[PDB]
Write a protein that binds this ligand. Structure first.
Ligand SMILES: CC[C@@H](C(=O)OC(C)(C)C)N1C(=O)[C@@H](CC(=O)O)C[C@H](c2cccc(Cl)c2)[C@H]1c1ccc(Cl)cc1
Length: 85
C-alpha cells in the first residue's frame, strides 16, 4: 500500500537518488527506499546511521537515526518529496 505510492522527489532528494544511478523524475516509494539503502551502504554511513556532514543529513534534518525506526524514517523522507496526483 505505502510502498506502491508514486512520488516526485524535491531537488535535494533527486540529487541523492541520481548519485546512485537513479535517472527518473518520478518513483514508487519502494524504489526510493531502496536507493537510500544503497546510498547508506556505499558512503558507509552505517542499526545506527550517521548522517552529519553528509547530504543525507541535509535531507533528514538530524545527525543520526536508526534503520529500525521506519515510521520516523518515512516522515523524514516525506518532507523531501510530493506525491504524484
Ligand atoms: C539501511 C539498509 C536498508 C535496506 O533494506 O537496503 C537494501 C538491503 C534493500 C539495499 N534497510 C534495511 O536494511 C532494513 C532495516 C531494518 O532491519 O529494519 C529495512 C529498512 C526499511 C524498510 C522499509 C521502510 C523503511 Cl522506512 C526502512 C531499509 C532502509 C531503507 C531506507 C532508509 Cl533511509 C533506511 C533503511
Amino acid at each position: 500500500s505505502e510502498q506502491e505510492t508514486l512520488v516526485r522527489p524535491k531537488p535535494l532528494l533527486l540529487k541523492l537518488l541520481k548519485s546512485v544511478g537513479a535517472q527518473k523524475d518520478t518513483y514508487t516509494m519502494k524504489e526510493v527506499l531502496f536507493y537510500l539503502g544503497q546510498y547508506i551502504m556505499t558512503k558507509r554511513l552505517y542499526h545506527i546511521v550517521y548522517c552529519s556532514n553528509d547530504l543525507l543529513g541535509d535531507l533528514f534534518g538530524v545527525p543520526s537515526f536508526s534503520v529500525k525506526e521506519h515510521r520516523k524514517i518515512y516522515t523524514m523522507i516525506y518532507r523531501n518529496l510530493v506525491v504524484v496526483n
